[PDB]
Design an enzyme around this catalytic site. Structure first.
Site, PDB file in Angstrom:
ATOM      1  N   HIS A 102       0.803  -1.231   0.000  1.00 25.73           N
ATOM      2  CA  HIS A 102       0.000   0.000   0.000  1.00 25.73           C
ATOM      3  C   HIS A 102       0.834   1.277   0.000  1.00 25.73           C
ATOM      4  O   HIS A 102       0.289   2.348  -0.278  1.00 25.73           O
ATOM      5  CB  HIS A 102      -0.911   0.103   1.233  1.00 25.73           C
ATOM      6  CG  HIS A 102      -2.053  -0.859   1.263  1.00 25.73           C
ATOM      7  ND1 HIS A 102      -3.187  -0.702   0.492  1.00 25.73           N
ATOM      8  CD2 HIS A 102      -2.273  -1.948   2.041  1.00 25.73           C
ATOM      9  CE1 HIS A 102      -4.037  -1.679   0.762  1.00 25.73           C
ATOM     10  NE2 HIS A 102      -3.510  -2.445   1.702  1.00 25.73           N
ATOM     11  N   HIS A 327      -9.704   9.392   0.239  1.00 29.97           N
ATOM     12  CA  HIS A 327      -8.792   8.269   0.132  1.00 29.97           C
ATOM     13  C   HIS A 327      -7.542   8.516   0.962  1.00 29.97           C
ATOM     14  O   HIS A 327      -6.713   7.613   1.094  1.00 29.97           O
ATOM     15  CB  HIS A 327      -8.431   8.018  -1.347  1.00 29.97           C
ATOM     16  CG  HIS A 327      -7.676   6.744  -1.584  1.00 29.97           C
ATOM     17  ND1 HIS A 327      -6.304   6.712  -1.753  1.00 29.97           N
ATOM     18  CD2 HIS A 327      -8.101   5.461  -1.690  1.00 29.97           C
ATOM     19  CE1 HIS A 327      -5.919   5.460  -1.949  1.00 29.97           C
ATOM     20  NE2 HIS A 327      -6.990   4.683  -1.916  1.00 29.97           N
TER      21      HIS A 327
END
Ligand SMILES: O=C(O)c1ccc(Nc2c(-c3ccccc3)nc3cnccn23)cc1C(=O)O
Length: 437
Positions: A102, A327
């Protein structure tokens, strides 16, 4: 500002809400430095789009893509990159099941120096279009002269901690970047690096990563105040993992306990979790398709209904971004009246054991599945006891730009968390559409 914390540009809000925001074309522009080469750490890539974000004169400079894709997904990325001979790829090893790469970071080597960018957006058009995303920009780090022996280290140990994070990949393309970082002077850095890497950490290594890394920094470089029990914890994220059958399993036993650490001495602390409701998503700029980047499955959600009583709506009037779905991920420790914060973290880490780590082996081992990276702003690193919260995000050396509204607003009785793989056919979104997975 000393903080160098930015939001990405949002298409469709009034110019006043984009004036101090950054698009990826801004970050890569020659105004920031004459690019020699770059590394792009991320989860998702649109390679054709990415290359077009570099200035034409820099489009053939070397690019390293650091990813975690395997098998056919890996093949698809390799095919995307094959038309560009200057693009190399590095596959991050993911040796523990169900882990993910990520981390979102740019390493930008210039003629003039080196810059580090730690941020929250994937390298695709939609993540830079109408989302709330966060960016930390490092200073321009100068090169250390040949024959000069200096550490180039900051008081926050950022240079050593970044090298340690890269060393964990055990990758030859990243040893090249470690050698670049060694040759530069990062002493001006005022943030702390907080990373996650996959593995099982015990003993001296247990403090290196994840929520124990956060704990250690807060013990070493924050101080406890009176009535610290009244200072809430706020977490804000775009995805939710399986946390257990109740809050004592992980959320309020080891995760919250790390987050409420302050000082070296030794809960009623309120925990506010901010995550978009269905209504937030429906009425957003993108409408229901924004929910394609808020992955929370019904399979996960149905096992932990207890958690949704901690959820608060996304609201961001302070930055004009109430309809730009988040996000970004952030965590922070505000005062009881939300006028001050004891610290602020922006990161890729969502609310999940995979990212932050879970204790194993009778509390002696921290298991992490994923790669994650973020930066921690501590008042002590700026000569302060706390940060004032900025009243309006875009409207000084002691005033931190929190990008959403405080206090967070609790879900109403009819609100539900956005769950991405069930249908919503009751009311249409801002483009006139329903959501049918
Ligand atoms: O940050 C976030 O919100 C985030 C959340 C999930 C991500 N990847 C992912 C997906 C998936 C997501 C979107 C489209 C298809 C598939 N599915 C899983 C299942 N298990 C583990 C990871 N998964 C990646 C990110 C990111 O942006 O890095």
């Amino acid at each position: 500002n000393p903080f160098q914390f930015y939001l990405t540009r949002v298409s469709g809000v009034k110019p006043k809400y984009n004036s101090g925001a950054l698009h990826i074309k801004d970050i890569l522009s020659p105004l920031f430095g004459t690019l020699v080469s770059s590394a792009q750490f991320n989860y998702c890539f649109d390679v054709d789009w990415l290359v077009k974000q570099y200035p034409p004169e820099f489009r053939k400079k070397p690019i390293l893509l650091v990813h975690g894709d395997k098998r056919e997904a890996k093949a698809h990325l390799h095919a995307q990159a094959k038309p560009y001979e200057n693009i190399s790829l590095c596959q991050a090893k993911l040796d523990i099941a169900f882990g993910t790469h990520h981390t979102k970071m740019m390493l930008l080597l210039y003629e003039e120096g080196l810059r580090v960018v730690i941020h929250t957006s994937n390298l695709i058009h939609a993540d830079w279009h109408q989302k709330t995303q966060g960016i930390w920009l490092s200073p321009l780090y100068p090169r250390i002269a040949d024959g000069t022996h200096k550490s180039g280290e900051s008081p926050t140990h950022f240079k050593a901690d970044l090298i340690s994070y890269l060393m964990a990949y055990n990758a030859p393309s990243l040893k090249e970047w470690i050698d670049v970082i060694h040759k530069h002077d990062l002493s001006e850095t005022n943030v702390y690096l907080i990373g996650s890497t996959p593995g099982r950490f015990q003993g001296s290594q247990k403090d290196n990563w994840g929520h124990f890394r956060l704990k250690k920094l807060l013990k070493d470089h924050a101080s406890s105040m009176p009535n610290a029990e009244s200072w809430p914890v706020v977490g804000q994220f775009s995805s939710v993992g399986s946390l257990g059958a109740d809050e004592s399993k992980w959320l309020c036993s080891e995760f919250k306990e790390s987050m409420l650490t302050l000082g070296k001495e030794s809960s009623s602390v309120p925990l506010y979790l901010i995550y978009p409701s269905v209504e937030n998503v429906r009425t957003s700029l993108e409408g229901y398709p924004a929910g394609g980047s808020l992955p929370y499955s019904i399979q996960t959600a149905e096992k932990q209904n207890w958690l949704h009583s901690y959820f608060h709506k996304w609201s961001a009037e302070t930055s004009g971004r109430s309809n730009a779905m988040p996000h970004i991920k952030t965590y922070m420790r505000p005062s009881p009246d939300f006028s001050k914060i004891a610290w602020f973290l922006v990161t890729s880490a969502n609310l999940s054991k995979a990212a932050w780590g879970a204790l194993e082996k009778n509390g002696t081992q921290l298991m992490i599945r994923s790669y994650e990276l973020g930066v921690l702003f501590l008042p002590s690193a700026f000569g302060l006891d706390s940060f004032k919260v900025k009243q309006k995000f875009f409207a000084p050396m002691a005033t931190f730009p929190v990008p959403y509204d405080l206090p967070p607003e609790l879900y109403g009785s009819k609100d539900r968390p956005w769950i991405w793989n069930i249908p919503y056919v009751k009311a249409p979104d801002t483009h006139g559409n329903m959501w049918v997975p």
